[model samples]
Target chain A: LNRHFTVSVFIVCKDKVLLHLHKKAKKMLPLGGHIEVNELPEEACIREAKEEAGLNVTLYNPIDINLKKSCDLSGEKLLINPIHTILGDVSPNHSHIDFVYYATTTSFETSPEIGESKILKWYSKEDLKNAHNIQENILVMATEALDLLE
Target chain B: LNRHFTVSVFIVCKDKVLLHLHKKAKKMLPLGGHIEVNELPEEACIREAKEEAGLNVTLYNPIDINLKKSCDLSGEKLLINPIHTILGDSHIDFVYYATTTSFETSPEIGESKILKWYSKEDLKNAHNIQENILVMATEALDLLE
Candidate 1:
């Protein structure tokens, strides 16, 4: 199968998760795309969030309980752990293995730049229930983001 | 601060996990290193295991229960989800589980030469095993069976 590495982020702001109606897929999706060459998954998360939502987002790590807490080192880069990694089919011939992450944004704007989806929405738990045509996997993960980040 | 993205794998065979004494860190660590540019995490896992241990391994995905099963596709690569992903002060490491049919290992020249196979009991009794390594190695053994 043709599998591509990708990253997606569930960005929470004020207890709501960010989602965009994918122009191509015609469904609500978290902000994400294929992992570019030489890009870290966390970097992809940040880039996708900013590209699709026009918000500067900070990734949240739910790993504080078990692993080493993050620290700063001069002139060094620190990677953020992804919460989940999923491999799902995009088509019969193609699949995407996504590195999933959760993030938060301070800005509320949904002004996506040109050539990407413009219909972005901040979804609360109730909004998710009312949302139509969202896939089951997206629904499950969106609810999870609200549950964990809110 | 500097950050590096890395991948490590716990290779299991015959109910034992493989680890090597890291020359620089001086600790028992799974076979892994930095994720080279353009390398997928799963690719890095297989490459690191082969580079460090000299054994051919297939990554095990415990994800069959939740995600889509991998199918054949021409010229396409499949990515395996890591069992655990850790963010430390210096590195963000993707940890994967794999299985090898053979017990023999021929590490590369200039790589760490000391390798050991640890059973669950050995891991529990070892004084120098890091808590993270101990926990993950035990989990690998338990799940690979």
Candidate 2:
């Protein structure tokens, strides 16, 4: 069982935020990645943003902290201990103590590359309501982040 | 030349704060990095803290904003054109935009692989005495950040 702490940057522009439909994870997530050993969370966020969205931006504030159900490198669900703790049961392959940040782009020109994501789009509150199969908790977070922007 | 930014996290326990010495830069600096695209200043501060100090801490407030005269990657002096507006004339870096949240750990348990200094020895009056003291003092401003 491998435990890892990750940081994510959630970029918001105007009334919309960016989302990427990851083919590997098979889920829609914000722009972020693993924190490198020598890199800071902000540095990792910026690097991931450039890789994921192909744009430069700045993070505003921390919006949320999340504990993701762990998964293996092969994307397999590792069933380990299921003790209910403060943050819930600890998963098997990975335990992502995620720090979510609020970010903004100086420009909207996104250069999303192939094989990174199936789709990259900006979602308004109404657009989020129309979308299905997305993580409910993330949706809630998005709403809270949007509210902070206001 | 490639541009970079850093965020230094200073942890105050009693009357003392944490500091680190860089062998290559031959000075003391804070725990921070260049701002990433779309990343906020505070986020960068936290990230730098984790990387340089191995401490999961929060920011408090900003202490100062530093703009100094220097050369570019090509080693040419940065100058401003009097008659016409030009780009890349000045190379400026913003420093210590905010202070940080209280740290969760001590400097002994920090990730810094080298020597560490205390605030009493590192800070002179309100200014950092070491060559790279800005990196060390920036985290102290979390009270204002």
Candidate 3:
């Protein structure tokens, strides 16, 4: 099977988390997409959030390893590790090994770029539980994002 | 800071998985090493398995994505996804689960290394195995079954 590297970000602002209506999937999903060639996963998350939701976000790194010296090495670089990673079965045709992340944003206002979905929602903890359209997995991730960032 | 990308493989053979006494860490570790520039993750795992343990391995992909035709397309390749991944202090590790047909190893005579196979029961009772290694070893064994 061909596995593609992807990123999924649950961006939180205070007590609520941001999600967008995916254009193709038509589902309320986190802001993320494919990780392009030669791009770091953190860069992908930042880029996806900007393109999809028109927001700038700072990713939350759950673990602190003393990588302070490693960044100066030539011809190599360290990446910000995902909060969680999973191999997701998108379909029988292909699968996505998604690097999942949590991020904090300063504002809830969104201005999606041209051709992207403008439908964005900021859901609080209670709102996430009552939403019928959101899938269980997304709900779990969304709830956790809120819990951690709040 | 420089972050080295490395690969680790928990290779299963029947009910047991292969591990070796790491030269520097002095702890029982899965067979793996650094990934060279321009090398794919699976390639690194295979090379490590051969160099460290003298065993051939087939990586397990938990999710099935059909990229069979994509392989025929120009300039792009799909890699077998790792079962787990972690970013450590000096390294970002791509962890894989693989299976081998034999338990034999052929380390260089000059190098001081010992290869052993541990079953789930053996890992529980052992003291030298690191906590993370123990969890991954058991997980690999259970999933492959």
Candidate 4:
């Protein structure tokens, strides 16, 4: 039972949410990472967003959720590619209780330095439905976040 | 430099905040404790609040702060009593912060329960106060949910 804390930021602007398409992992994920020692989860989310997506943002109060079930990480799926576990483990036996947050920012500027995510795009709910190479869970999360606005 | 995580609840009702006058600690303090591996910070805060204050309350989100530097526990004459540490010894600390959205009942209904002042009158110039004092004061003032 390895305990890990994570911070995820959802940035919504003009009815569209920002997402990063990871080239290596081949999945669409929001900006987030593990909470570091001596640092707050909000600070970790802000730092991870800047480092991963090249976007500076601030996080709000965390909406925490626990995942006791282990993640499936075998290189056997097509759309859901089994990439390296960025924060948690690959075996289907660990728990990842995540603390998610929704942050507001009007600015979007990419840094010169590139990361594993080559593309950054803002997608509306309809636009997201049309996107072919996105993960199913991300689409679910995006829909849930969008619904929260109403 | 020990690392620890704690969850604390700020119970505010009718211009008064809920606190426990610890017989051992001998000071008014918020309800909190070390978080368990299975429980989330919010859950921990709520659980601790119920046990310490004997009230049912809702907890909000985590308000992150560095307690070691903020509390100034290292100072010689800073503690309220002979206790060396204010809350506890930890170089790094994270507080799962929350405010009472709605209380099911009064905290004073319990036999051992006692409500304390909200400190609204005292925190007017909290910025000029010491780090630990300001930390607890500002957190109560901000009361982020």
Candidate 5:
């Protein structure tokens, strides 16, 4: 029961998706990070993508399509691929609400200069299984994410 | 940091909202509960409303207004106030959208709390409730067309 909220995003481009090596976790991961206290979940997803891979991506999810004279209390959308709300640890008692989202790269000239010391690379859907030593659990999630685009 | 993502609902009928006295949390909570692993978040909201008050519900959010021939991934709309993704206990609560068919609907008076429906004035006069609950209740009422 780690007590914090974070966002996870899998960015896609053409038939391949972006993958990066986490500096501390030492495993390849999709581009994502923590949600700031002031940020909405969607904003956090967009921000993480830009910071990590220098890629501009659009989040996909089922939210309200605001209309003329819409209800005043109308604005909560579902994620494109809300993969898992996994309860992973932050320390002993600390935990996180991993609010996952799926996204597609709006363009191709994405870079990774600001994300970290690591440069990112792309992997096709079939190559995702063992690419960069990622686990089966992530592979399963990655597959689901890629499926959304297809 | 106890990770427990849950949903909070403001069951509405016309202008009033339904509420319950939660025994453990000691708050005058809207009907909501945990998101079981097998359940979708929307399904959890629907189930909580039913289990707590024996009421049927439909979840609503801001999205396309399509009734037929809509997209395959379009059915699961979120609650109106999917607010309060608080990390405290990781209880990611959403203020759900549910409408009881009749104001005369009888709550189950289910265990763990005393169930009751209140008019907006009745709710306004009560000060013990959390302000966020009041905000959501107010929003649910205002959104009523």
Candidate 6:
């Protein structure tokens, strides 16, 4: 498998989640990118969030969860287990082990400073169903993230 | 990145654990392999378990503690959230596990290795098994408990 880590966020507000029409894929997708060298997944989420949508978000996981314990430090090894982790097919030859996350902003505001093509936008729960070309996983995760908020 | 999916099962029974002295990897590893053309992760674990350990065992996941409800089949899609997942060095591994006290595997050489059962102590003494794998094996065993 030629896969790396990609952190995707369902940036949720009260009833809507932020989605964007991608520059290349030309489809709606969550805001996220690759996990750089030595980067913790949560940190990647925050960085990607700010870079893409300029929305500071509190990641839902990693804040709480006991996934593993290490003996070397014999202390907490907190990890953000993805809401859903999937081996997304980028192409016939390449795949992405996408780590999907849920994030929320108290106020809906954004200033996209990075990326050449992402048009920042938000979608209602029902709107996702009507929207096309979005990855199924994103639609599912967005719905789940918002449902949990309720 | 070219990523293929593999499922590994840490089959534990009591204090002892099952391991395969893998032929290619040349180390003590659990039952695991590629996700194949159209198999789900859990299904892959079952097939790999039968091929290697020769025991019908249960797959363990910490996420089961909060396993969600399968939403309606209304245009419906229900994907299982991995209890634990990581972007591993070689591939994206979706690890599954089983625990059985007794095992009797026959031929089974279609794929990998020499299967055997070892206590947690035996695992530590395994020089052939790499330090990290050994450590992960130990952690998987601990989760079983």
TM-scores for all predictions: 0.64, 0.42, 0.58, 0.51, 0.53, 0.59
Docking class of 3: incorrect
lDDT per residue, candidate 5, A19-100, as tens digits?
7777655667777777765456678888888787777787766543331112222233222334334433531134445566
The full ranking of all candidates by lDDT, starting with the best, is 1, 3, 6, 5, 4, 2
Local error of candidate 1 at residue A133 (angstroms):
1.9
| TM-scores of chain A in all candidate models | 0.84, 0.71, 0.88, 0.65, 0.78, 0.83
Supply every candidate's count of residue pairs whose N, Cα or C atoms clash at under 3 angstroms.
9, 41, 8, 0, 12, 7
Give the DockQ (2 decimals) of all models.
Answer: 0.16, 0.02, 0.07, 0.03, 0.10, 0.19
Model 6, chain B only, scores a TM-score of 0.78
Residue B22 of candidate 5: its Cα lDDT? 68
Candidate 1 lDDT tens digits, B53-115: 998998986543322322222222234667766655344677888999988998998788989
RMSD of 4: 15.8
True contacts kept of each: 0.06, 0.00, 0.01, 0.02, 0.09, 0.21
Q: Give the poorly placed runs of model 6, Cα more than 4 Å off.
A: A1-3, A62-76, A91-93, A116-118, A133-135, B1-9, B12-81, B85-96, B99-145
lDDT of 3 at A135: 59
Candidate 3 residue A129 Cα shift, in angstroms, is 2.4
**TM-score ranking, high to low:** 1, 6, 3, 5, 4, 2
Q: So what's the TM-score on candidate 5?
A: 0.53
Candidate 5 runs further than 4 Å off: A1-3, A64-83, A90-94, A113-117, B1-6, B9-145
Q: Which has the better lDDT: candidate 4, or candidate 5?
A: 5
Q: Which 10-residue window of candidate 5 chain A scores lowest in summed lDDT?
A: A65-74
Clashing pairs in 4: none
- Model 4 spans > 4 angstroms off: A1-3, A12-15, A22-26, A58-93, A104-115, A132-150, B1-3, B11-17, B22-27, B54-145
Model 4 chain B: ten consecutive residues of lowest lDDT: B76-85
